[PDB]
Enzyme design. Structure first.
Site, short mmCIF file in Angstrom:
data_model
loop_
_atom_site.label_atom_id
_atom_site.label_comp_id
_atom_site.label_asym_id
_atom_site.label_seq_id
_atom_site.Cartn_x
_atom_site.Cartn_y
_atom_site.Cartn_z
N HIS A 221 -23.09 -13.05 9.11
CA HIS A 221 -23.28 -13.91 7.96
C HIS A 221 -24.71 -13.84 7.45
O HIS A 221 -25.63 -13.55 8.19
CB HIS A 221 -23.00 -15.39 8.29
N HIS B 229 12.50 -0.15 -4.12
CA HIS B 229 11.36 0.59 -4.57
C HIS B 229 10.56 0.15 -5.79
O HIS B 229 9.32 0.08 -5.75
CB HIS B 229 11.97 1.97 -4.91
N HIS C 189 -9.89 5.23 11.18
CA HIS C 189 -11.08 5.18 10.35
C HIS C 189 -11.11 6.31 9.35
O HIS C 189 -12.11 6.49 8.67
CB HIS C 189 -12.34 5.25 11.20
N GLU D 164 11.07 12.64 -3.49
CA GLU D 164 12.22 13.22 -4.16
C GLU D 164 12.08 14.73 -4.36
O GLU D 164 13.03 15.52 -4.44
CB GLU D 164 12.35 12.51 -5.50
N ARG E 95 14.50 3.74 -13.98
CA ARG E 95 13.29 4.53 -14.23
C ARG E 95 13.42 5.98 -13.73
O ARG E 95 13.86 6.29 -12.62
CB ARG E 95 12.03 3.87 -13.65
C1 LIG Z 1 5.95 4.85 -2.25
C2 LIG Z 1 5.93 5.01 -3.76
C3 LIG Z 1 5.94 6.26 -4.45
C4 LIG Z 1 5.93 6.28 -5.86
N1 LIG Z 1 5.73 7.47 -6.41
C5 LIG Z 1 5.66 7.63 -7.74
C6 LIG Z 1 5.38 8.97 -8.30
O1 LIG Z 1 5.18 9.93 -7.52
N2 LIG Z 1 5.35 9.06 -9.68
C7 LIG Z 1 5.59 7.93 -10.47
O2 LIG Z 1 5.54 7.95 -11.69
N3 LIG Z 1 5.83 6.72 -9.92
C8 LIG Z 1 5.84 6.55 -8.61
N4 LIG Z 1 6.10 5.31 -8.05
C9 LIG Z 1 6.10 4.24 -9.06
C10 LIG Z 1 4.37 3.91 -9.38
O3 LIG Z 1 3.87 3.78 -8.06
C11 LIG Z 1 4.24 2.47 -9.96
O4 LIG Z 1 5.40 1.73 -9.53
C12 LIG Z 1 2.94 1.84 -9.40
O5 LIG Z 1 2.01 2.77 -9.84
C13 LIG Z 1 2.66 0.55 -10.08
O6 LIG Z 1 1.41 0.48 -10.82
P1 LIG Z 1 0.74 -0.84 -11.19
O7 LIG Z 1 -0.60 -0.62 -11.73
O8 LIG Z 1 1.58 -1.54 -12.12
O9 LIG Z 1 0.72 -1.57 -9.83
P2 LIG Z 1 0.23 -1.39 -8.33
O10 LIG Z 1 -0.27 -0.06 -7.98
O11 LIG Z 1 1.03 -2.17 -7.39
O12 LIG Z 1 -1.12 -2.15 -8.35
C14 LIG Z 1 -1.11 -3.62 -8.15
C15 LIG Z 1 -2.23 -4.93 -8.07
O13 LIG Z 1 -2.11 -6.32 -8.32
C16 LIG Z 1 -2.56 -6.88 -7.07
N5 LIG Z 1 -2.04 -8.22 -7.32
C17 LIG Z 1 -0.76 -8.65 -7.42
N6 LIG Z 1 -0.70 -9.93 -7.74
C18 LIG Z 1 -2.03 -10.37 -7.82
C19 LIG Z 1 -2.67 -11.58 -8.14
N7 LIG Z 1 -1.91 -12.66 -8.41
N8 LIG Z 1 -4.00 -11.57 -8.15
C20 LIG Z 1 -4.68 -10.47 -7.89
N9 LIG Z 1 -4.25 -9.23 -7.62
C21 LIG Z 1 -2.89 -9.26 -7.60
C22 LIG Z 1 -1.54 -6.24 -6.17
O14 LIG Z 1 -1.79 -6.47 -4.81
C23 LIG Z 1 -1.64 -4.80 -6.65
O15 LIG Z 1 -2.47 -3.96 -5.85
C24 LIG Z 1 5.88 5.13 -6.69
C25 LIG Z 1 5.86 3.88 -6.02
C26 LIG Z 1 5.88 3.83 -4.61
C27 LIG Z 1 5.87 2.45 -3.97
C1 HEC Z 2 -8.25 -0.21 9.82
C2 HEC Z 2 -7.77 0.85 9.08
C3 HEC Z 2 -9.74 -0.10 10.27
C4 HEC Z 2 -10.82 -0.05 9.47
C5 HEC Z 2 -10.90 -0.01 7.93
C6 HEC Z 2 -11.99 0.00 10.32
N1 HEC Z 2 -11.58 -0.02 11.64
FE1 HEC Z 2 -12.75 0.16 13.25
N2 HEC Z 2 -11.16 0.31 14.41
C7 HEC Z 2 -9.83 0.18 14.04
C8 HEC Z 2 -9.01 0.46 15.19
C9 HEC Z 2 -7.47 0.39 15.14
C10 HEC Z 2 -9.81 0.76 16.22
C11 HEC Z 2 -9.49 1.09 17.69
C12 HEC Z 2 -8.33 1.98 18.08
C13 HEC Z 2 -8.52 3.45 17.91
O1 HEC Z 2 -7.63 4.15 18.49
O2 HEC Z 2 -9.49 3.87 17.22
C14 HEC Z 2 -11.19 0.66 15.75
C15 HEC Z 2 -12.33 0.90 16.50
C16 HEC Z 2 -13.61 0.55 16.16
C17 HEC Z 2 -14.77 0.46 17.00
C18 HEC Z 2 -14.82 0.84 18.51
C19 HEC Z 2 -14.72 2.36 18.69
C20 HEC Z 2 -15.93 3.14 18.27
O3 HEC Z 2 -15.77 4.35 17.96
O4 HEC Z 2 -17.07 2.59 18.29
C21 HEC Z 2 -15.80 0.05 16.25
C22 HEC Z 2 -17.27 -0.20 16.69
C23 HEC Z 2 -15.31 -0.14 14.90
N3 HEC Z 2 -13.95 0.17 14.86
C24 HEC Z 2 -16.04 -0.58 13.81
C25 HEC Z 2 -15.63 -0.43 12.50
C26 HEC Z 2 -16.52 -0.42 11.35
C27 HEC Z 2 -18.04 -0.57 11.45
C28 HEC Z 2 -15.76 -0.18 10.28
C29 HEC Z 2 -16.30 -0.08 8.81
C30 HEC Z 2 -16.78 1.14 8.46
C31 HEC Z 2 -14.38 -0.07 10.70
N4 HEC Z 2 -14.34 -0.23 12.07
C32 HEC Z 2 -13.30 0.12 9.88
C33 HEC Z 2 -9.41 -0.17 12.77
C34 HEC Z 2 -10.19 -0.12 11.64
#
Ligand SMILES: Cc1cc2nc3c(=O)[nH]c(=O)nc-3n(C[C@H](O)[C@@H](O)[C@@H](O)COP(=O)(O)OP(=O)(O)OC[C@H]3O[C@@H](n4cnc5c(N)ncnc54)[C@H](O)[C@@H]3O)c2cc1C
Ligand code: HEC
Ligand code: HEC
Ligand code: HEC
Ligand code: HEC
Length: 560
Positions: free
Chosen positions: A16, A494, A54, A369, A535
């Site tokens: 923090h 979907h 990562h 697809e 669609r």
């Molecule tokens: C697995 C998969 C494959 C697909 N592949 C294709 C493809 O190959 N070609 C194609 O044309 N289409 C594809 N589709 C369809 C395409 O993905 C669209 O459906 C998707 O792009 C939707 O775009 P969007 O900008 O409307 O939304 P999204 O990409 O969903 O972006 C959404 C943002 O609004 C955020 N949000 C929602 N509510 C709030 C809120 N109240 N406040 C703040 N943030 C909020 C959400 O979390 C979200 O991230 C695919 C979809 C999926 C799931």
């Molecule tokens: C989810 C996708 C993650 C994000 C984004 C970040 N971390 Fe991560 N971290 C994650 C897992 C699931 C694990 C452990 C399991 C595995 O098999 O890797 C970790 C591990 C670490 C560690 C300990 C290991 C090491 O190499 O030091 C640290 C210190 C750590 N993670 C820190 C870290 C930081 C600084 C990140 C921002 C850049 C970050 N993590 C992203 C899951 C995820």
């Protein structure tokens, strides 16, 4: 949990900004700044691994704190969709409980009068492709923009996209000898959506295709490998070189250009109410860590995406899907709609809900697809075909649903694999069965060898241009170069074709006054009209980029 393991060290101060504790802002930039300063960043941690948490396909900034939670158990965000069994220090189970957009109303009211915190020109709700494209466009000669995303990471469903962005004509199309025309965009899009699509919308979705695909190109994108999606004629689903996926690629390119101009992007920030003059005055944001807050603005672009993923709501219009799985990320639950509805917006085609026919139960992911497009045939539990594999999704979902055990098997070749690079990912996920022969493939899959072989050798005959079984119109490849592969797939909720009503300018029309609610914009899966009742493959991404651009620009002239 992580902050106790770190309290043991130096204090509150470690992370923090102050010794009392507390977050400054919702993006959590300070704290993540502290993470990296003692642990390194993602590239650094990525390089250190031997599938690593990562380093992945996720786009944009991926905060450390999106998984490594301070005051609570931590979960890989990868577990929303995969089951990698990572061993996360201070682990927990992924769990999301959908909470109403309107609940805690007293609190929201107590908080609306309680000051006025910031003011910007144009607010954008959501960070997928429609929201970032709008960001570029509003920003790009125009206004100030503040984009809110409720997830801890960006790009919505956009970033999972696999198969391509439809475009007509004048895309790089020239360069591959693919002959195609605008009206053939419109016409298969009216055919695909069963002729109810708003005609003016499908038009601009046809006529701006090329420029949206040039735009992406003005920005860093790679839309040059073209394929065939179920339902169109001339080939036109643009994607990155050799069969990779456009989603991540487009999201990323739009994220950087959005961040590169001055967008003010904020994660862990849910818009829960549009502010009522009834002209749109602002927005009520619940920042996950900083509490509630008002943003005054002159235009609101709604780009919140669809509701596929909310099985409670989807089951409300089509209860066939109750209990089904969804291919979406965790944020597509309908918040957006709800916020707009509250603001009195009209909607249409809310009931037409697209199920993807080939989702993988075991992997928790859709399988593109394009695998069928490049030659795959689908086989039931008995070892035979039962459909024209490149048919419409609704017909394909229905036939697999009508089969022995409700699921089916994608079966392809070494030749189909080579040719569509998305297949390396499925191979990487351990969800792909392998046979040195079809007889070998059968044993893994638990389908009968003679019958599957007979199926395949017959399909080969059809391959000779005629499918005297099911009419498949394209038979690209023969299915005879070993090893041979298979994956069981089944239909999953979907896309939600319906949504808010908008014009060609992206304006949202009021239910009551059948005219635009002022300064209310919308683009993407949250809108209705573009796709009629069905669609077309690759029309989502094209809808979202074209319509984001229009929604950003319209909103900027407003306020100007
Ligand atoms: C697995 C998969 C494959 C697909 N592949 C294709 C493809 O190959 N070609 C194609 O044309 N289409 C594809 N589709 C369809 C395409 O993905 C669209 O459906 C998707 O792009 C939707 O775009 P969007 O900008 O409307 O939304 P999204 O990409 O969903 O972006 C959404 C943002 O609004 C955020 N949000 C929602 N509510 C709030 C809120 N109240 N406040 C703040 N943030 C909020 C959400 O979390 C979200 O991230 C695919 C979809 C999926 C799931
Ligand atoms: C989810 C996708 C993650 C994000 C984004 C970040 N971390 Fe991560 N971290 C994650 C897992 C699931 C694990 C452990 C399991 C595995 O098999 O890797 C970790 C591990 C670490 C560690 C300990 C290991 C090491 O190499 O030091 C640290 C210190 C750590 N993670 C820190 C870290 C930081 C600084 C990140 C921002 C850049 C970050 N993590 C992203 C899951 C995820
Ligand atoms: C420097 C003052 C640190 C800051 C800021 C953060 N962490 Fe940390 N972390 C630090 C140390 C010296 C250690 C201990 C190593 C040991 O073996 O005792 C850690 C530990 C972790 C772990 C490790 C769990 C384990 O596998 O033992 C993780 C996953 C981790 N830290 C993550 C993390 C995150 C997400 C931070 C931002 C909020 C962060 N750390 C801040 C030093 C420092
Ligand atoms: C749901 C929103 C996902 C989250 C969160 C993560 N992944 Fe994912 N992943 C998802 C899909 C739909 C796909 C397939 C796309 C396609 O082309 O069909 C994938 C793909 C992978 C792969 C294999 C392919 C590759 O690009 O390597 C891997 C190894 C993978 N995903 C791992 C992974 C990790 C480590 C994640 C946490 C950072 C993660 N995914 C998030 C869906 C979703
Ligand atoms: C780094 C490991 C941390 C330490 C040592 C402390 N906090 Fe703390 N804090 C951290 C993170 C990542 C967050 C965001 C949300 C989460 O839980 O991951 C926070 C948030 C807070 C809050 C908000 C409560 C909430 O709504 O979740 C508070 C009150 C807070 N942080 C205070 C605080 C105090 C007093 C600490 C000293 C003991 C402290 N935090 C340690 C990361 C870290």
């Amino acid at each position: 949990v992580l902050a106790d393991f770190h309290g043991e060290m130096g204090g509150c101060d470690s992370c923090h900004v102050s010794d009392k504790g507390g977050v400054t802002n919702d993006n959590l930039t300070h704290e993540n700044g502290q993470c990296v300063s003692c642990h390194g960043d993602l590239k650094e941690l990525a390089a250190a691994a031997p599938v690593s948490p990562h380093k992945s396909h996720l786009i944009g900034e991926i905060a450390c704190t999106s998984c490594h939670k301070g005051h609570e158990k931590s979960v890989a965000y990868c577990d929303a969709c995969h089951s990698f069994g990572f061993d996360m220090p201070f682990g927990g189970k992924w769990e999301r409980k959908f909470v109403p957009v309107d609940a805690d109303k007293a609190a929201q009211d107590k908080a609306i009068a309680a000051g006025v915190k910031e003011t910007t020109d144009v607010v954008i709700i959501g960070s997928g492709g429609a929201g970032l494209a709008a960001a570029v466009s509003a920003r790009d000669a125009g206004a100030k923009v503040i984009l809110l995303e409720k997830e801890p990471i960006p790009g919505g469903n956009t970033k999972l996209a696999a198969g391509g962005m439809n475009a007509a004509e004048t895309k790089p199309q020239a360069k591959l000898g693919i002959e195609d025309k605008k009206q053939i965009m419109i016409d298969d899009t009216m055919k695909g959506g069963r002729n109810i699509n708003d005609p003016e919308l499908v038009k601009v979705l046809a006529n701006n295709s090329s420029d949206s695909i040039d735009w992406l190109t003005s920005m860093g994108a790679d839309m040059t490998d073209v394929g065939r999606m179920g339902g169109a004629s001339v080939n036109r689903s643009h994607r990155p070189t050799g069969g990779a996926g456009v989603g991540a690629h487009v999201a990323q390119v739009l994220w950087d250009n959005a961040v590169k101009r001055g967008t003010d992007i904020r994660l862990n920030s849910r818009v829960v109410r549009i502010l009522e003059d009834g002209k749109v005055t602002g927005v009520l944001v619940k920042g996950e860590y900083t509490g509630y807050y008002v943003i005054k603005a002159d235009a609101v672009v709604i780009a919140a995406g669809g509701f596929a993923k909310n099985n409670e709501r989807v089951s409300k219009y089509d209860p066939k899907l109750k209990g089904f799985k969804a291919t979406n990320h965790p944020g597509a639950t309908g918040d957006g709609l709800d916020v707009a509805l509250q603001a009195g917006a009209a909607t249409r085609d809310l009931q037409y809900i697209q199920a993807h026919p080939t989702y993988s139960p075991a992997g928790g992911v859709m399988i593109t697809e394009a695998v069928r497009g490049n030659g795959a045939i689908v086989v039931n539990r008995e070892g035979n075909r039962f459909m024209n594999e490149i048919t419409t999704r609704d017909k394909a979902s229905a036939a697999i649903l009508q089969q022995k055990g409700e699921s089916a098997y994608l079966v392809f070749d070494d030749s189909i694999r080579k040719s569509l690079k998305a297949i390396e990912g499925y191979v990487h996920l351990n969800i792909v069965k392998e046979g040195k022969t079809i007889e070998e493939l059968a044993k893994q899959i638990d389908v009968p060898a003679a019958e599957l072989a007979k199926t395949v050798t017959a399909y080969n005959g059809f391959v000779s241009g005629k499918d005297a079984q099911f009419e498949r119109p394209d038979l690209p490849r023969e299915l005879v170069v070993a090893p041979f592969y298979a994956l069981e797939i089944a239909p999953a909720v979907h896309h939600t074709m319906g949504g808010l009503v908008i014009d060609t300018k992206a304006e949202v029309k009021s239910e009551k006054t059948a005219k635009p609610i002022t300064g209310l914009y919308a683009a993407g899966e949250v809108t209705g009209g573009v796709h009629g009742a069905n669609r077309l493959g690759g029309n989502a991404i094209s809808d979202i980029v074209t319509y984001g651009r229009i929604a950003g620009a319209s909103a900027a002239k407003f306020a100007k």
